[PDB]
């Protein structure tokens, strides 16, 4: 699965080894026609996924404080 | 502005030159005792940040579907 959160920024979500590969990274175009991640990005650990969502309320609040 | 979202992974919402950036990066402890931001991570702006939260309804579905 490939979601999008911004221009040239897609979220890679697929089966990998023995876990769900959730990688949020910039997506560049392949010479052929596909798209793949670059360098700027971070993978969302299954455990981090929950913590991040829960911290969103505080994170978002900090954004409005700046 | 330092929100822990996992182990060695912290979301830092800092204003950079007049731009509130939600930098989701890793932090490794130096020999001194301070956590320094690693090279692996991504700086999301409020715009992409909003989309990320909105895309959760889609991403979470793929994560909850093992």
């Amino acid at each position: 699965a490939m979601f999008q959160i911004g221009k040239m920024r897609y979220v890679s979500v697929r089966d990998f080894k023995g876990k769900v590969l959730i990688d949020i990274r910039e997506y560049w175009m392949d010479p052929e026609g596909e798209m793949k991640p670059g360098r700027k990005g971070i993978s969302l650990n299954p455990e981090q996924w929950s913590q991040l969502k829960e911290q969103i309320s505080d994170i978002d609040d900090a954004v409005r404080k700046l | 502005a330092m929100f822990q979202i996992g182990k060695m992974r912290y979301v830092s919402v800092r204003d950079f030159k007049g731009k509130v950036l939600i930098d989701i990066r890793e932090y490794w402890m130096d020999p001194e005792g301070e956590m320094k931001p690693g090279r692996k991570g991504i700086s999301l702006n409020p715009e992409q940040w909003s989309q990320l939260k909105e895309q959760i309804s889609d991403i979470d579905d793929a994560v909850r579907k093992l």
Partner: peptide
Amino acid sequence: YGALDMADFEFEQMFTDALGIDEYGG
């Protein structure tokens, strides 16, 4: 495929780093 496969082999690089560390404890 040129970049597709290239930016795939390096997926496990962060998989065994970011996608594998929170389940280590807590």
